[PDB]
Design an enzyme around this catalytic site. Structure first.
Site, PDB file in Angstrom:
ATOM      1  N   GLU A   1     -13.507  -2.897  -9.742  1.00 47.44           N
ATOM      2  CA  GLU A   1     -12.536  -2.011  -9.115  1.00 47.44           C
ATOM      3  C   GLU A   1     -11.967  -2.638  -7.851  1.00 47.44           C
ATOM      4  O   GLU A   1     -12.708  -3.147  -7.014  1.00 47.44           O
ATOM      5  CB  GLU A   1     -13.174  -0.661  -8.777  1.00 47.44           C
TER       6      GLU A   1
ATOM      7  N   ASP B   1       0.872 -10.256  -0.429  1.00 45.23           N
ATOM      8  CA  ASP B   1       0.489  -9.162   0.460  1.00 45.23           C
ATOM      9  C   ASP B   1       1.677  -8.758   1.316  1.00 45.23           C
ATOM     10  O   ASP B   1       2.782  -9.266   1.127  1.00 45.23           O
ATOM     11  CB  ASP B   1      -0.740  -9.509   1.324  1.00 45.23           C
ATOM     12  CG  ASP B   1      -0.420 -10.448   2.485  1.00 45.23           C
ATOM     13  OD1 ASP B   1       0.764 -10.777   2.706  1.00 45.23           O
ATOM     14  OD2 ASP B   1      -1.381 -10.873   3.170  1.00 45.23           O
TER      15      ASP B   1
END
EC number: 3.2.1.17
Length: 133
Positions: A4, A13
């Protein structure tokens, strides 16, 4: 079975930097490549070794191997140049494990970045604090 919150394909980013796996950045990233879990762990190994190379000279006492791993994860996330890193290492060198635990526990509920790597921030706290007891 991917973890996850881990991206296995590189992405840019917010500040435009290519990133992949456990917050890995660097010129070694292959754009468009789908990384395997093992490859992501190899990148993390590489990044933590780089952290260790930076901070080992500042660790002047023998420490439990679990505490060591915790420190590398801490510095990987917080930065080697942060005063928080300098104070943490100084307390450990002095044997002030209780003081180190106190420092970490100020930040328990900060909740900022996604902590990067296979350890959680709470696992780091636990590692250092359980030695203070």
């Amino acid at each position: 079975d991917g973890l996850e919150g881990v991206s296995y394909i590189p992405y840019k980013d917010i500040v435009g930097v290519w990133t992949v796996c456990h917050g890995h950045t660097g010129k070694d990233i292959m754009l468009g490549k789908t990384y395997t879990k093992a490859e992501c762990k190899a990148l993390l190994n590489k990044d933590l070794a780089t952290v260790a190379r930076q901070i080992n000279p500042y660790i002047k006492v023998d420490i439990p191997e679990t505490m060591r791993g915790a420190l590398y994860s801490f510095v990987y996330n917080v930065g080697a140049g942060n005063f928080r890193t300098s104070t943490l290492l100084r307390k450990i060198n002095q044997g002030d494990i209780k003081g180190a635990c106190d420092q970490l526990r100020r930040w328990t509920y900060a909740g900022g970045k996604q902590w990067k790597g296979l350890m959680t921030r709470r696992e780091i706290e636990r590692e250092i604090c359980l030695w203070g007891q």
